[PDB]
Enzyme design. Structure first.
Site, PDB file in Angstrom:
ATOM      1  N   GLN B  74     -37.412  -5.568  66.982  1.00  0.00           N
ATOM      2  CA  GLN B  74     -38.336  -6.820  66.128  1.00  0.00           C
ATOM      3  C   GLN B  74     -38.755  -6.088  64.380  1.00  0.00           C
ATOM      4  O   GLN B  74     -39.193  -4.710  64.208  1.00  0.00           O
ATOM      5  CB  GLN B  74     -39.126  -7.586  67.027  1.00  0.00           C
ATOM      6  CG  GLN B  74     -38.728  -7.252  68.456  1.00  0.00           C
ATOM      7  CD  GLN B  74     -39.588  -8.287  69.123  1.00  0.00           C
ATOM      8  OE1 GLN B  74     -41.006  -8.224  70.073  1.00  0.00           O
ATOM      9  NE2 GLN B  74     -39.110  -9.809  69.357  1.00  0.00           N
ATOM     10  N   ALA B 194     -51.572   2.162  66.116  1.00  0.00           N
ATOM     11  CA  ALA B 194     -50.943   2.980  67.147  1.00  0.00           C
ATOM     12  C   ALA B 194     -50.872   4.507  66.920  1.00  0.00           C
ATOM     13  O   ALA B 194     -50.475   4.406  66.418  1.00  0.00           O
ATOM     14  CB  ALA B 194     -50.351   2.454  67.823  1.00  0.00           C
ATOM     15  N   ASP B 263     -39.437  -4.333  79.516  1.00  0.00           N
ATOM     16  CA  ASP B 263     -38.038  -3.568  79.278  1.00  0.00           C
ATOM     17  C   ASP B 263     -38.956  -2.251  79.246  1.00  0.00           C
ATOM     18  O   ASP B 263     -38.519  -1.304  77.688  1.00  0.00           O
ATOM     19  CB  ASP B 263     -38.468  -4.935  77.395  1.00  0.00           C
ATOM     20  CG  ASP B 263     -37.111  -4.578  76.533  1.00  0.00           C
ATOM     21  OD1 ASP B 263     -36.668  -3.484  77.026  1.00  0.00           O
ATOM     22  OD2 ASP B 263     -37.637  -4.258  75.361  1.00  0.00           O
ATOM     23  N   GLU B 268     -38.862   8.808  77.394  1.00  0.00           N
ATOM     24  CA  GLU B 268     -39.181   9.688  77.074  1.00  0.00           C
ATOM     25  C   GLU B 268     -39.762  10.923  77.620  1.00  0.00           C
ATOM     26  O   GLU B 268     -41.094  11.238  77.633  1.00  0.00           O
ATOM     27  CB  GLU B 268     -39.993  10.203  75.548  1.00  0.00           C
ATOM     28  CG  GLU B 268     -38.675   8.501  74.348  1.00  0.00           C
ATOM     29  CD  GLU B 268     -39.222   8.846  72.826  1.00  0.00           C
ATOM     30  OE1 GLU B 268     -39.934   9.459  73.003  1.00  0.00           O
ATOM     31  OE2 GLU B 268     -38.838   7.331  72.332  1.00  0.00           O
TER      32      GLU B 268
END
Lengths: 380, 383
Positions: B74, B194, B263, B268
């Site tokens: 998105q 962020a 989701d 990572e």
């Protein structure tokens, strides 16, 4: 010896009927000759030197691989040998003189090899032939357990204590932590090798719930703990009025009472024979925890149902006369185990006193229902 | 101040082992002091007042240039500031009162700026310190997005609505159309800035698959969805029997259930540390979509594996005591953002209810494998 007198007496020369095309489940290695000797009525019969020789194999055949049955009550290991036969390994958790503390519930009790060993010999002396053979064994836990497993969940738990001893604990739920570890001095632990029944692929086993299963919770009593006429209804419940089953459960509950083993939550059968065969007396590690205390709770099935097998009643009467008697007959064998003495004298001495309680539970019960109603008859 | 009481408790005074010459990733601007503060075990630590001051930069630093990440799921924008440091911007796609429709799959869910922010505070209250800092911000989308972008694909999508508001949508795949445009009233959109992790040129990140990753289509069930003994096997698979790793996924899988973020298809790591570091809790935009619904599928990793960290278990029990509690501890901090309230109050109420499911799932699970098997001990030798 005392044991020579017993197996010559005619009560131990009772022979079984002839085996049909059924009744079979199925100079090879000894673990395999044990499997094929299993039939409908017993697990090995009085003769059969394979059982004695399989006990030497469990003691001294080289351990080639060790694996861990995960998520059990306590630690049990699977030993695989050079000759493709395997065995179940229960290690020493407590010393010989120790007793379970009185404030312990039956489901907090340890599994100890002393009972595993004594249960196979105690069962063999009662001519039941239902317990798979078990031998005691000292295992170099460096050379024979740690260094011969590719199951890193078991290898990872090995450490060295501040005492320079080798310790380990595996992965179960009750007592598999560092504070409940098993430590050799400096690297031998001792335990019981129970011979393995044939693989579940080629010998399915039905797993049964027994009707006197205790309430594995505190405060909450079980069905038989509240209903004194519990056995009037159990003799009319499906599979238990067809045998050789009520007769076989009374056999087992005298077995269990002699050891004080109150953990008979299930019993297994061999399927291929149906609802009319013998009961495999497995996982007997909870007995011989208390020797100065007789647990009558286990016996309640006998005072409530009031009937035994005649074969097993007449033998019990014999095992109380001093010329035979369990104690000396029990210490006579169990002297052919490596972990000697596998039972300290108070446990062998309590076996006699527990025995005469079974005989009195029958005499008070035989004079209220009469013979024939109490005592069956397999002597024909 | 309930938030004051929490950070005085000894469970929030836990100290880390000593940092060697490794364990630092590296060897001023506020965004750069955040980069060098990254070590092997955490991402900033409670001390580091830079993080609080870095959030002020995301609030008030001049936006100098804005570009569009090509090929995102998105709409996701990249903000670069006067001091050469950058940040990630997710615009407001959903309102505060809305819930995701019940008939929506996890992969049709919107990513919303409220989740990006609230996940950072929720993670900081759990003393995980794994989410990069995020501050909310109102952006004049004329002066701060359109008129300061050199990306023709972002500029072309700006239009004026029949209500005389300014709208835009960019070019992604989910919800990048005129009928899903982002419209100010009339030209302020609001979103989450962020702070940016260090550039991948000088800090490789290994990307791991998590073993409870869903089967991202309908009809097809996932590996763990049929086999209740799935994790008996996952604790015997390469990297998950060596850590501090199965335990670190239990930290993350409790995080996600608290927010309802289902989701978490990948996670990572920093590579420069190896298989023995923490998990960066990224991309939390799929959480906090439903507050009247508790998604148990996310917790399945915990009910199957049945082992948590003791540091993290005791804090979870602590975050349930009424004198601490998620609710007051979350609305306390989240009040320090410009976008107050970043979470509507039933979401803070749902944070409490979801917590007590985790504490009961450990209680029901600790009474079937027992302690020692379930609760690992890392407070050995700590206050």
């Amino acid at each position: 010896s005392v044991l020579q007198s017993l197996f010559e007496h005619p009560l131990y020369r009772t022979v079984l009927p002839d085996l049909t095309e059924e009744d079979t489940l199925f100079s090879y290695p000894n673990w395999l000759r044990f499997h094929i000797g299993i039939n409908r009525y017993e697990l090995y019969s009085r003769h059969n030197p394979v059982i004695a020789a399989l006990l030497r194999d469990l003691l001294s055949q080289k351990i080639s691989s060790v694996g861990m049955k995960s998520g059990g009550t306590q630690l049990k290991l699977i030993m695989s040998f050079q000759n493709y036969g395997q065995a179940l390994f229960k290690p020493m958790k407590q010393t010989r003189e120790q007793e379970t503390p009185p404030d312990f519930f039956y489901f907090s009790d340890f599994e100890r090899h002393n009972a595993e060993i004594a249960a196979f010999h105690l069962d063999r002396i009662l001519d039941f032939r239902r317990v798979p053979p078990v031998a005691g064994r000292l295992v170099n836990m460096t050379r024979e357990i740690r260094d011969v497993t590719r199951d890193k969940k078991l290898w990872r738990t090995f450490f060295v204590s501040p005492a320079n001893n080798i310790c380990f604990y595996g992965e179960c739920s009750y007592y598999c932590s560092t504070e409940h570890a098993l430590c050799g001095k400096p690297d031998q632990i001792e335990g019981s090798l129970a011979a393995f029944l044939p693989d579940l692929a080629l010998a399915k086993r039905k797993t049964w719930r027994n009707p006197w299963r205790r309430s594995y919770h505190k405060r909450k009593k079980a069905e038989w703990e509240v209903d004194p006429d519990y056995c009037d209804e159990v003799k009319q419940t499906p599979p238990y009025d067809r045998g050789t089953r009520l007769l076989d459960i009374m056999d087992m509950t005298i077995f269990d009472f002699l050891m004080g083993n109150m953990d008979r939550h299930h019993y297994e059968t061999f399927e291929k024979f149906g609802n009319d065969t013998f009961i495999i007396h497995l996982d007997n590690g909870r007995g011989f925890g208390k020797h100065s205390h007789d647990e009558m709770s286990i016996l309640v099935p006998l005072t409530q149902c009031c009937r035994v097998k005649r074969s097993t009643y007449l033998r019990l009467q014999l095992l109380a006369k001093e010329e035979y008697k369990l104690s000396s007959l029990m210490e006579e064998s169990l002297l052919q185990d490596r972990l000697v003495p596998v039972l300290i004298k108070p446990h062998l001495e309590a076996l006699d006193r527990r025995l005469r309680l079974v005989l009195k539970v029958l005499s008070d019960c035989v004079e209220k229902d009469g013979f024939s109603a109490v005592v069956e008859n397999d002597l024909d």
